[PDB]
């Protein structure tokens, strides 16, 4: 046939850059990385240590603890009182979490057990839950409104904090339950069923989950905080990545005055023990952490950055002498 076209691509002569892994170009990236990762790791490690955190385990598995009575709650409403003290006052916003250990919220048979269409406020899915939430589709004759294992096994303890002052009268601590979930989840992913004004008439022809004491009608008094758009429910449904996790529970807001939000002293945790986890060696915790401008409290990254920063610098020296030897 005829002559080939004299194109750069066709003739394999496209303009190109030929990088060579030379000693004068790779030695820097093993030193500048070392000089950047070391300060970053120190900054992370130092700032993480500056965060003041108290972790209190109230599962009561061990005896000689003031919550063991609720492991066998002959009476359904059981309460525990755990006393703790803060060495120094917490400043700024303080976040109250609850931690569950050995709780595989990431199990495949568990993560799938939800109906995203139903939680999005689909009238079709309200009375026709998907087969993904198979074991909790219908309770007796009508479908569960939040079908699935994830909604059924919702953490349902109540945690309260009290300050014990000089007068010894326990002062209650205001705790804000709003604004603890992702903004997208509140306004996009989770939405109440369409139509109506009263949640009672929206959730008709649907029953509560078998494990829940009360229906979705009154998960919270506020109309904007009940239904599928409840903060506690949404926070729970955002399944964790690992067996040990913490989920934001309440917010402690900065006081109007200049005094610390949680002044150092004597504190008591009044918890309504409802959630049983001891059968599978589960642990329940209450965590209080102070807000930090740069992330939370992550000592692992600080150590890892220093370790990688030191190895990278050490690799530069080892590679430098090897290059010099073979120069």
């Amino acid at each position: 046939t005829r002559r080939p076209d004299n194109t750069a691509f066709k003739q394999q002569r496209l303009p190109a850059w030929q990088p060579i892994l030379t000693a004068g170009t790779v030695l820097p990236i093993f030193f500048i990385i070392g000089l950047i990762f070391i300060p970053i790791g120190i900054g992370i490690f130092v700032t993480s240590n500056n965060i003041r955190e108290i972790e209190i385990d109230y599962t009561g598995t061990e005896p000689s603890s003031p919550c063991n009575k609720c492991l066998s709650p002959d009476v359904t409403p059981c309460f525990c009182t755990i006393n703790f003290t803060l060495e120094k006052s917490f400043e700024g916003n303080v976040f109250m979490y609850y931690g569950l250990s050995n709780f595989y919220q990431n199990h495949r048979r568990y993560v799938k057990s939800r109906d995203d269409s139903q939680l999005n406020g689909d009238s079709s899915a309200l009375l026709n839950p998907s087969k993904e939430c198979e074991p909790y589709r219908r309770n007796e004759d009508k479908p569960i409104a939040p079908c699935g294992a994830i909604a059924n096994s919702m953490f349902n303890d109540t945690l309260e904090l009290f300050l014990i002052g000089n007068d010894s009268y326990p002062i209650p601590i205001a705790l804000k339950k709003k604004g603890i979930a992702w903004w997208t989840d509140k306004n996009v992913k989770f939405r109440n069923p369409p139509g109506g004004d009263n949640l009672e008439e929206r959730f008709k022809g649907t029953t509560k989950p078998v494990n829940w004491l009360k229906p979705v009608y009154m998960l919270d008094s506020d109309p904007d905080n009940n239904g599928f758009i409840n903060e506690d429910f949404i926070v729970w449904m955002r399944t964790a990545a690992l067996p040990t996790f913490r989920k934001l529970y309440r917010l402690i807001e900065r006081k109007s005055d200049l005094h610390p939000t949680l002044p150092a002293g004597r504190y008591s945790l009044n918890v309504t023990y409802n959630y049983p986890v001891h059968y599978f060696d589960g642990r329940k915790r209450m965590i209080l952490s102070t807000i930090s401008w740069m992330g939370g409290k992550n000592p692992f990254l600080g150590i890892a950055y220093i370790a990688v920063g030191s190895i990278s610098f050490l690799l530069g020296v080892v590679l430098l002498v090897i290059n010099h030897k073979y120069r």
């Binding site: 080939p4 003739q11 595989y104 996009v188 992913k189 990545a241 952490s289 990254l301 590679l319």
Partner: protein
């Protein structure tokens, strides 16, 4: 036996000639002349293509996933969108294999429509080749190809003589004379009588024995036997004959040359076999990991799963059944270690790499307008692994052009660049031939010292020397229009006659008893008294003539060795001429010594009567003729010698040296005679003065000694230089290819296997091997021996039908295109016009194709284990429940959108060194010889690389997620954020790795690498959704936190920095051959 009838196409359609097939097919015994080189005809495409699609291990592995995804209790997908991915991947190769086959469907058309002439009615009518049927009577003209194996019936030449060149059928460059039967000669001349010809031929069944033929013809109530001298085979071309008539005996697949073509086999690359072993290993790894994790899930469900009230699914599944049922769950989850893009990417890489061969302007032959052609798009990286090259000689290493160069007279060599009466300077203008009336410009001669000698006449022996060339030949001349065009059966005489014509000793006309040679414009008509025939054993021919004066002189020309045994005692030029021949011999030119003697009138008469007695003899006239021939030739006065060059293709000696430096062994397998094959060996520089030539006799002693020795040590000392010139007849002998019945056969195969191995051990110890007079079956037999007893990757390059068998038998087959014949090109894998383009096919295209394919495989399995093994490490943190670490929608797009393009461009554009610099350093090819880039060991290093990458990609994020990670209202501490962090680190890590693998950073390479990362980080910011709208929210949360980005940066750094150190440490302590060139690239 075979049966044929003239002008009767219904006789061969009788019911009893239908062989019949097992499955409702007739399959007549007589094949139609239509040929077939394609694979898929109309509807055999589907079953035949899928059969060879599934020779790949992964295709059976993908099919297993389809069966596994159709089981409801383990099915994860709808099963209506897992089949379509496989069909599209299968369809991509099906279309690619169809465009390749459509190309060779068109190749058949141009050869099946060659429009010969046939008797299908009262008189001849034009008909295509495919329209030829056994028993047809056809007519051919000058330079026409023979449509099939025909029997001469007549021709315009006297005695129904016919000349055909068999360069297609063997390597011979001279014409064979074919003659018809005496009775058929005189009764089938006029066209009308051919139509009524009704002759019945009983001949042998179709065979592959080109040399001999057996049969009989019954006609006019008489029987006439037949032999191979009356049969024109399909590959022949009619020469020096205006027209001829034949009767078709065999046709199509039954033709005696088509039975020499081998069996078409499905050719697979050495890496194609390697890929199977890697898929087999991954399948075993996949089964072991899934079974190991299944046992974990069974144990996990025993104490943890059964106690977990929240993990209640209302199914009374025992932990053993749950573990069994999750084993298939992990087969599906971890299946991406071999993704469906494995062969879509390989075929996209191979298709593009094959089109660089077609597009190459350096492999484009402008003179014949013949570009290279990769006519199979499936054997590309094998061009980078060739161990042996088996080459034809005639038409492959040579141009089939033969030119007069020099000449020696009385010890003086004429032909060198000279002017006036003595050498002045090397730069000499072209000789002027206008002084001779008949001369033309074909002869490029640079010597003026010879011109003066002939014209001056001071040396009468000079004039008699060139007069010999105009008489001692035996060719006929055409004076149709006064052009004095010469038709020579042997190109040696054609060049000599043409050359001697330009020197003034022009041959004008021939007669049974006289000749009309013109000597420097002087018309002298000699008388022919006796012509001594030319034959191989004699190695010389002579002519006896009577001068116009009356003197009788014998003119002889032939091999130097035979003549020197028949020289007069008085010959002062004997020693000087011997020196001159060595100069021509050292220059690789054919030397024909010229000699003569004086014959007296009384001496001739006594010998003349004996010569007539031998001629009139009917018993052994050939032997009787040789008896008188020796008697007359006793003392010959040597006159000198000539010099003729068998013009090689330009760039052939330079190609053999470069491919030798790449450690490629080049064997010349030719159907031409030994002397021609050996002479071209020296011209190509395959043989040199250092080489000691060993023939069949020398080899036979060594091999027989080795067998007696047993009744391994190298056959030659290690430091020697040797070559083999083995004749095809000797090849059968040395290879032994010339109840108790079953018992003896095992020993018969026992020594035959041993004897073949010994020859290959001997043959491969030699620098060069030249196989001469080998049949097309023997050409493929030699390639097979190297393939079998050396496990070498073999390339076969040739032209014509005699190379089809070895072209189809070798790992890579090359056909030389651009010429009239195309038998080898149709059956070849690659096609280019000049032998010298074998440098770029191997040292540029093949070398790069091997590098680009090995870098693709190294990265492809790296980036799939790094992606997939994260599910394995996540198993220990989710109950071994087969939960995926990524979002379900990232797994689908990862192999198509995030890591697909960058490796494809690297597989199409990467270059370790320039083509100009890869030809300058042929030793770089040697890396593909030994298969160093990608072993089975290098495969596991990429698995370890991907296994450790998945360790870092999971356990650096896991350490950060076990602790506080931006715990705020917008906390990304959940599974979805955990999923987009490993995916973000994975996408950056792998796309930075290909950037480190890439050595030729074209703009498209940079665009794809950063485009792949940008596309991932554009898709997961709702940019793709915004575009669709113009035409859940996890990413906007996880990727806005400093810790999540610090985690991603740290994870990428830990993955890549150790790789850069290892690459730099290996490059600086164990630099490769390429690395040294890249460092000193500018200095070079």
């Amino acid at each position: 036996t075979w049966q044929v009838k003239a002008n009767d196409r219904k006789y061969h359609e009788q019911p009893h000639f239908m062989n019949t097939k097992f499955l409702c097919i007739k399959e007549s015994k007589y094949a139609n002349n239509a040929i077939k080189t394609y694979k898929y005809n109309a509807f055999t495409f589907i079953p035949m293509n899928l059969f060879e699609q599934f020779k790949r291990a992964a295709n059976l592995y993908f099919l297993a996933l389809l069966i596994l995804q159709a089981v409801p209790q383990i099915s994860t997908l709808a099963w209506y969108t897992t089949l379509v991915p496989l069909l599209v991947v299968l369809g991509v190769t099906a279309i690619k294999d169809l465009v390749d086959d459509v190309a060779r469907h068109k190749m058949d058309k141009e050869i099946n429509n060659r429009t010969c002439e046939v008797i299908k009615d009262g008189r001849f009518k034009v008909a295509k080749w495919k329209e030829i049927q056994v028993g047809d009577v056809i007519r051919l003209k000058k330079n026409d190809f023979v449509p099939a194996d025909i029997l001469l019936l007549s021709s315009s030449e006297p005695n129904s003589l016919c000349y055909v060149e068999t360069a297609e059928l063997d390597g011979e460059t001279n014409l064979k004379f074919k003659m018809s039967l005496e009775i058929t000669d005189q009764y089938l001349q006029r066209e009308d009588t051919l139509a009524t010809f009704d002759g019945f031929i009983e001949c042998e069944e179709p065979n592959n024995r080109l040399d001999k033929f057996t049969g009989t013809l019954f006609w006019r109530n008489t029987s006439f036997p037949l032999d191979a001298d009356k049969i024109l085979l399909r590959g022949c071309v009619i020469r020096n004959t205006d027209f001829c008539h034949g009767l078709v005996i065999f046709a199509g697949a039954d033709t005696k040359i088509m039975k020499n073509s081998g069996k078409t086999r499905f050719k697979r690359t050495k890496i194609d076999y390697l890929m199977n072993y890697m898929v087999y290993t991954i399948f075993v790894v996949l089964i072991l990991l899934s079974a190991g994790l299944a046992i974990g899930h069974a144990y996990w469900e025993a104490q943890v799963g059964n106690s977990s009230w929240y993990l209640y699914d209302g199914e009374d599944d025992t932990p053993s059944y749950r573990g069994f049922l999750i084993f298939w769950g992990y087969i599906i989850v971890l299946n991406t270690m071999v993704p469906i893009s494995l062969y879509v990417s390989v075929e996209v890489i191979r298709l593009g790499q094959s089109h660089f061969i077609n597009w190459d302007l350096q492999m484009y032959y402008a003179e014949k307008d013949t570009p290279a052609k990769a006519r199979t798009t499936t054997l590309n990286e094998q061009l980078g692994q060739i161990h042996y090259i088996f080459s034809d000689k005639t038409g492959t290493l040579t141009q089939n052009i033969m030119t007069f160069k020099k000449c020696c007279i009385n010890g003086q060599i004429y032909g060198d660049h000279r002017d006036a009466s003595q050498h002045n300077h090397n730069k000499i203008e072209q000789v002027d031939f206008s002084w001779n009336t008949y001369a033309d410009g074909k002869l490029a001669f640079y010597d003026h010292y010879l011109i003066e000698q002939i014209q001056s006449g001071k040396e009468p022996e000079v004039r008699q020397f060139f007069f010999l060339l105009a008489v001692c030949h035996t060719v006929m001349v055409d004076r149709t229009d006064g052009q004095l065009n010469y038709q020579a059966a042997s190109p040696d005489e054609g060049a000599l006659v043409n050359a001697a014509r330009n020197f003034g000793f022009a041959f004008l006309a021939r007669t049974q008893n006289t000749i009309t040679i013109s000597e420097l414009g002087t018309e002298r008509t000699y008388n022919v008294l006796a012509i001594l025939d030319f034959n191989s054993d004699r190695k010389r021919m002579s002519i006896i003539v009577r001068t116009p004066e009356g003197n009788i002189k014998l003119y002889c020309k032939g091999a130097d060795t035979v003549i020197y045994e028949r020289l007069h005692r008085m010959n002062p030029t004997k020693q000087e001429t011997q020196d001159a021949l060595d100069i021509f011999a050292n220059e690789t030119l054919r030397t024909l010594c010229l000699c003569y003697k004086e014959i007296e009138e009384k001496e001739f008469t006594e010998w003349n009567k004996k010569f007539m007695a031998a001629s009139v003899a009917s018993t052994n006239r050939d032997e009787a003729l040789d008896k008188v021939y020796e008697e007359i030739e006793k003392d010959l006065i040597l006159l000198g010698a000539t010099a003729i060059e068998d013009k090689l293709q330009d760039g052939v000696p330079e190609t053999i040296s470069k491919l030798a430096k790449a450690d490629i062994k080049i064997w010349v397998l030719t159907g031409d005679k030994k002397e021609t094959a050996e002479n071209i060996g020296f011209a190509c520089e395959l043989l040199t003065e250092d080489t000691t030539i060993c023939y069949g006799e020398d080899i036979n002693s060594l091999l027989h000694a080795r067998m007696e020795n047993q009744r391994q040590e190298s056959f030659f000392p290690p430091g020697g230089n040797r070559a083999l010139i083995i004749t095809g007849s000797w090849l059968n002998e040395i290879l032994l290819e010339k109840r108790m019945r079953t018992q003896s056969k095992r020993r018969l195969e026992a020594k035959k296997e041993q004897r073949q191995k010994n020859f290959v051990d001997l043959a491969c110890e030699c620098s060069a091997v030249i196989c001469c007079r080998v049949t097309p079956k023997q050409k493929a037999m030699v390639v097979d021996l190297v393939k079998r007893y050396k496990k070498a990757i073999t390339l076969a390059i040739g032209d014509g039908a005699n190379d089809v068998n070895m072209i189809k038998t070798a790992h890579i087959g090359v056909g030389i295109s651009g010429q009239e014949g195309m038998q080898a090109v149709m059956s070849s894998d690659y096609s280019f016009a000049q032998f010298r383009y074998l440098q770029r096919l191997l040292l540029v295209h093949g070398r790069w194709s091997y590098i680009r394919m090995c870098k693709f495989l190294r990265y492809f399995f790296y980036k799939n284990f790094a992606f997939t093994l994260v599910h394995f490490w996540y198993s220990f943190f989710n109950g071994y429940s087969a939960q995926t670490a990524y979002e379900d929608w990232f797994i689908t797009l990862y192999n198509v959108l995030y890591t697909s393009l960058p490796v494809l461009l690297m597989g199409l554009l990467d270059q370790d060194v320039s083509d100009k610099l890869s030809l300058r350093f042929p030793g770089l090819y040697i890396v593909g010889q030994r298969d160093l880039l990608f072993n089975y060991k290098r495969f596991f290093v990429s698995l370890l690389h991907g296994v450790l990458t998945s360790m870092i990609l999971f356990f650096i994020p896991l350490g950060a997620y076990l602790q506080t990670v931006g715990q705020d209202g917008e906390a990304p501490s959940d599974y979805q954020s955990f999923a987009v962090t490993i995916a973000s680190a994975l996408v950056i890590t792998v796309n930075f790795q290909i950037g480190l693998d890439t050595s030729y950073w074209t703009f498209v390479n940079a665009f794809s690498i950063f485009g792949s990362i940008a596309l991932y980080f554009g898709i997961m910011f709702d940019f793709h959704s915004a575009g669709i709208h113009v035409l859940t929210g996890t990413a906007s949360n996880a990727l806005r936190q400093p810790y999540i980005w610090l985690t991603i940066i740290l994870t990428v750094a830990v993955c890549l920095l150790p790789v850069v150190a290892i690459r730099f440490l290996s490059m600086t302590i164990w630099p490769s051959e390429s690395d040294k060139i890249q460092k000193h690239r500018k200095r070079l």
